[PDB]
Write an enzyme that holds these catalytic residues in place. Structure first.
Site, PDB file in Angstrom:
ATOM      1  N   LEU A  17      -4.280  -0.618  11.298  1.00 28.25           N
ATOM      2  CA  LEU A  17      -5.131  -1.742  10.914  1.00 28.25           C
ATOM      3  C   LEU A  17      -4.548  -3.151  11.092  1.00 28.25           C
ATOM      4  O   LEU A  17      -5.278  -4.090  11.429  1.00 28.25           O
ATOM      5  CB  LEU A  17      -5.581  -1.551   9.466  1.00 28.25           C
ATOM      6  CG  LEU A  17      -6.328  -0.249   9.169  1.00 28.25           C
ATOM      7  CD1 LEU A  17      -6.543  -0.121   7.676  1.00 28.25           C
ATOM      8  CD2 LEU A  17      -7.656  -0.224   9.907  1.00 28.25           C
ATOM      9  N   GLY A  18      -3.246  -3.299  10.859  1.00 32.77           N
ATOM     10  CA  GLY A  18      -2.608  -4.599  10.999  1.00 32.77           C
ATOM     11  C   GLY A  18      -1.114  -4.508  11.251  1.00 32.77           C
ATOM     12  O   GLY A  18      -0.575  -3.417  11.453  1.00 32.77           O
ATOM     13  N   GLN A  19      -0.438  -5.656  11.242  1.00 34.65           N
ATOM     14  CA  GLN A  19       1.006  -5.704  11.474  1.00 34.65           C
ATOM     15  C   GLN A  19       1.719  -6.138  10.198  1.00 34.65           C
ATOM     16  O   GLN A  19       1.264  -5.834   9.093  1.00 34.65           O
ATOM     17  CB  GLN A  19       1.334  -6.691  12.601  1.00 34.65           C
ATOM     18  CG  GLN A  19       2.605  -6.364  13.386  1.00 34.65           C
ATOM     19  CD  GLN A  19       2.401  -5.229  14.382  1.00 34.65           C
ATOM     20  OE1 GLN A  19       1.533  -5.305  15.254  1.00 34.65           O
ATOM     21  NE2 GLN A  19       3.201  -4.175  14.255  1.00 34.65           N
ATOM     22  N   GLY A  20       2.833  -6.851  10.348  1.00 36.32           N
ATOM     23  CA  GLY A  20       3.568  -7.305   9.181  1.00 36.32           C
ATOM     24  C   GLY A  20       4.780  -8.158   9.495  1.00 36.32           C
ATOM     25  O   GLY A  20       5.533  -8.526   8.595  1.00 36.32           O
ATOM     26  N   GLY A  21       6.679  -4.676   7.587  1.00 37.23           N
ATOM     27  CA  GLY A  21       5.906  -3.449   7.498  1.00 37.23           C
ATOM     28  C   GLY A  21       4.586  -3.529   8.245  1.00 37.23           C
ATOM     29  O   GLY A  21       4.446  -4.334   9.164  1.00 37.23           O
ATOM     30  N   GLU A  22       3.620  -2.698   7.860  1.00 41.13           N
ATOM     31  CA  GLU A  22       2.309  -2.698   8.503  1.00 41.13           C
ATOM     32  C   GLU A  22       1.262  -1.940   7.691  1.00 41.13           C
ATOM     33  O   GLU A  22       1.587  -1.325   6.675  1.00 41.13           O
ATOM     34  CB  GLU A  22       2.414  -2.115   9.917  1.00 41.13           C
ATOM     35  CG  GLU A  22       3.148  -0.796  10.007  1.00 41.13           C
ATOM     36  CD  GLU A  22       3.444  -0.393  11.442  1.00 41.13           C
ATOM     37  OE1 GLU A  22       2.496  -0.043  12.177  1.00 41.13           O
ATOM     38  OE2 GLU A  22       4.629  -0.432  11.837  1.00 41.13           O
ATOM     39  N   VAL A  23       0.007  -1.993   8.131  1.00 40.24           N
ATOM     40  CA  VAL A  23      -1.077  -1.315   7.429  1.00 40.24           C
ATOM     41  C   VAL A  23      -1.864  -0.379   8.348  1.00 40.24           C
ATOM     42  O   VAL A  23      -2.307  -0.779   9.426  1.00 40.24           O
ATOM     43  CB  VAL A  23      -2.045  -2.342   6.790  1.00 40.24           C
ATOM     44  CG1 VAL A  23      -3.146  -1.622   6.020  1.00 40.24           C
ATOM     45  CG2 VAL A  23      -1.274  -3.274   5.862  1.00 40.24           C
ATOM     46  N   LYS A  37       0.161   1.408   3.687  1.00 40.48           N
ATOM     47  CA  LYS A  37       0.995   0.252   3.974  1.00 40.48           C
ATOM     48  C   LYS A  37       2.425   0.770   4.085  1.00 40.48           C
ATOM     49  O   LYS A  37       2.939   1.405   3.159  1.00 40.48           O
ATOM     50  CB  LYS A  37       0.906  -0.783   2.851  1.00 40.48           C
ATOM     51  CG  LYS A  37       1.703  -2.049   3.129  1.00 40.48           C
ATOM     52  CD  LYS A  37       1.652  -3.017   1.961  1.00 40.48           C
ATOM     53  CE  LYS A  37       2.365  -4.321   2.294  1.00 40.48           C
ATOM     54  NZ  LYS A  37       2.343  -5.285   1.155  1.00 40.48           N
ATOM     55  N   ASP A 125      -1.136 -15.388  -5.689  1.00 38.73           N
ATOM     56  CA  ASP A 125      -1.598 -15.633  -4.328  1.00 38.73           C
ATOM     57  C   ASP A 125      -3.060 -15.239  -4.132  1.00 38.73           C
ATOM     58  O   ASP A 125      -3.414 -14.527  -3.194  1.00 38.73           O
ATOM     59  CB  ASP A 125      -0.706 -14.901  -3.323  1.00 38.73           C
ATOM     60  CG  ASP A 125      -0.906 -15.396  -1.895  1.00 38.73           C
ATOM     61  OD1 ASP A 125      -1.142 -16.612  -1.705  1.00 38.73           O
ATOM     62  OD2 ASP A 125      -0.806 -14.570  -0.960  1.00 38.73           O
TER      63      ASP A 125
HETATM   64  N1  LIG Z   1      -7.413  -0.714   1.334  1.00 35.63           N
HETATM   65  C1  LIG Z   1      -7.379  -1.347   2.504  1.00 35.63           C
HETATM   66  N2  LIG Z   1      -8.161  -0.952   3.520  1.00 35.63           N
HETATM   67  C2  LIG Z   1      -8.138  -1.590   4.678  1.00 35.63           C
HETATM   68  N3  LIG Z   1      -7.351  -2.633   4.893  1.00 35.63           N
HETATM   69  C3  LIG Z   1      -6.545  -3.076   3.919  1.00 35.63           C
HETATM   70  C4  LIG Z   1      -6.542  -2.437   2.689  1.00 35.63           C
HETATM   71  C5  LIG Z   1      -5.630  -3.137   1.907  1.00 35.63           C
HETATM   72  C6  LIG Z   1      -5.290  -2.879   0.437  1.00 35.63           C
HETATM   73  C7  LIG Z   1      -3.774  -2.817   0.233  1.00 35.63           C
HETATM   74  C8  LIG Z   1      -2.994  -2.181   1.191  1.00 35.63           C
HETATM   75  C9  LIG Z   1      -1.615  -2.113   1.031  1.00 35.63           C
HETATM   76  C10 LIG Z   1      -1.026  -2.687  -0.090  1.00 35.63           C
HETATM   77  C11 LIG Z   1      -1.802  -3.325  -1.049  1.00 35.63           C
HETATM   78  N4  LIG Z   1      -1.155  -3.833  -2.096  1.00 35.63           N
HETATM   79  C12 LIG Z   1      -1.665  -4.448  -3.160  1.00 35.63           C
HETATM   80  O1  LIG Z   1      -2.871  -4.616  -3.327  1.00 35.63           O
HETATM   81  N5  LIG Z   1      -0.736  -4.864  -4.016  1.00 35.63           N
HETATM   82  C13 LIG Z   1      -0.905  -5.489  -5.181  1.00 35.63           C
HETATM   83  C14 LIG Z   1       0.243  -5.849  -5.874  1.00 35.63           C
HETATM   84  C15 LIG Z   1       0.163  -6.411  -7.142  1.00 35.63           C
HETATM   85  C16 LIG Z   1      -1.085  -6.609  -7.722  1.00 35.63           C
HETATM   86  C17 LIG Z   1      -2.234  -6.247  -7.033  1.00 35.63           C
HETATM   87  C18 LIG Z   1      -3.581  -6.408  -7.742  1.00 35.63           C
HETATM   88  F1  LIG Z   1      -3.734  -5.418  -8.613  1.00 35.63           F
HETATM   89  F2  LIG Z   1      -3.605  -7.570  -8.385  1.00 35.63           F
HETATM   90  F3  LIG Z   1      -4.575  -6.371  -6.863  1.00 35.63           F
HETATM   91  C19 LIG Z   1      -2.152  -5.692  -5.761  1.00 35.63           C
HETATM   92  C20 LIG Z   1      -3.182  -3.387  -0.889  1.00 35.63           C
HETATM   93  N6  LIG Z   1      -5.155  -4.112   2.681  1.00 35.63           N
HETATM   94  N7  LIG Z   1      -5.673  -4.075   3.798  1.00 35.63           N
HETATM   95  C21 LIG Z   1      -5.371  -5.032   4.872  1.00 35.63           C
HETATM   96  C22 LIG Z   1      -6.347  -6.214   4.876  1.00 35.63           C
HETATM   97  C23 LIG Z   1      -6.723  -6.396   6.350  1.00 35.63           C
HETATM   98  C24 LIG Z   1      -5.574  -5.705   7.087  1.00 35.63           C
HETATM   99  C25 LIG Z   1      -5.503  -4.418   6.266  1.00 35.63           C
END
Ligand SMILES: Nc1ncnc2c1c(Cc1cccc(NC(=O)Nc3cccc(C(F)(F)F)c3)c1)nn2C1CCCC1
Length: 254
Positions: A17-20, A21-23, A37, A125
């Site tokens: 899905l993306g870059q960065g 680590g990565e997703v 991630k 953020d």
């Molecule tokens: N579910 C997903 N499905 C498709 N894409 C996703 C995700 C996500 C969700 C995601 C993925 C990997 C890590 C995270 N991390 C967090 O949300 N961390 C976080 C850390 C502290 C607090 C919180 C929160 F609870 F306040 F939201 C969140 C969240 N991100 N992305 C990216 C956004 C566009 C490029 C891909």
């Protein structure tokens, strides 16, 4: 290490899905669609896992949920089928969105933050890039990794509070109302700061009800304890078209 750990053979990194680590767009236990991630060893593992530690103490509908980890590093969470709010507003979907669909998202975001507020935590953020979108205009607060989005006291003295997030939400509204444009157009970082201190505040966006810009101006008050709680913001955006703009009418793009 704990109940959240999971074996890497449960995952299947299907799409990047993306870059960065990565997703990636993996699949947990070969039956559940999820988001994966990963980390390319650059920060400490225990540092990268701080993002996971927090997601274990926060469980709300408008917050991206943590599913499981892989300390050997992977972070698994629910999958938001429509990427971030930014990509979504900037995609070909952004031209079809009007004020109602945008206030609806603003309010949902305010709600996950109202949970944060009650939980006594701070996101630090909050911006359109860290707000994921799923099916049926569903939105959830997230994270992955911004002075034009940061409150004066925060960026200047490190005074980060939930009231500093209220500042960021205000900037989120200009993003929703402009459908993805960068706040403070034509201005550079150290020009934004020198300016906002002097009293400057972004002007009301095109076709945006002055009552909605009024709220932005409350989220940007100089005195932190003067900004509204997300509790007020959520309710405000929930009753918008009945209590505030009952005579609203669809426009060219808003
Ligand atoms: N579910 C997903 N499905 C498709 N894409 C996703 C995700 C996500 C969700 C995601 C993925 C990997 C890590 C995270 N991390 C967090 O949300 N961390 C976080 C850390 C502290 C607090 C919180 C929160 F609870 F306040 F939201 C969140 C969240 N991100 N992305 C990216 C956004 C566009 C490029 C891909």
């Amino acid at each position: 290490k704990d109940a959240w750990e999971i074996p890497r053979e449960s995952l299947r990194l299907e799409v990047k899905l993306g870059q960065g680590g990565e997703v990636w767009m993996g699949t947990w236990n070969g039956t559940t669609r999820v988001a994966i991630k990963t980390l390319k060893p650059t920060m400490s593992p225990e540092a990268f896992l701080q993002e996971a530690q927090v997601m274990k103490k926060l469980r709300h509908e408008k917050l991206v949920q943590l599913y499981a980890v892989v300390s050997e590093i992977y972070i698994v969470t629910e999958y938001m089928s429509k990427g971030s709010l930014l990509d979504f507003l900037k995609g070909e979907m952004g031209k079809y969105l009007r004020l109602p669909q945008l206030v609806d998202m603003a309010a949902q975001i305010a709600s996950g933050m109202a949970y944060v507020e009650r939980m006594n935590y701070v996101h630090r953020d909050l911006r359109a890039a860290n707000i994921l979108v799923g099916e049926n205009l569903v939105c959830k607060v997230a994270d992955f990794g911004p002075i034009k989005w940061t409150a004066p006291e925060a960026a200047l003295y490190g005074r980060f509070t939930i009231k500093s997030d209220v500042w960021s939400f205000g900037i989120l509204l200009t993003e929703l109302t402009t459908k993805g444009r960068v706040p403070y157009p034509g201005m550079v970082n150290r020009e934004v700061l020198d300016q906002v201190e002097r009293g400057y505040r972004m002007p009301c966006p095109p076709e945006c009800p002055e009552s909605l810009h009024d709220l932005m101006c409350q989220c940007w008050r100089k005195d932190p304890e003067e900004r509204p709680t997300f509790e007020y913001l959520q309710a405000f955006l929930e009753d918008y078209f009945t209590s505030t703009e009952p005579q609203y009418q669809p426009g060219e793009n808003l």
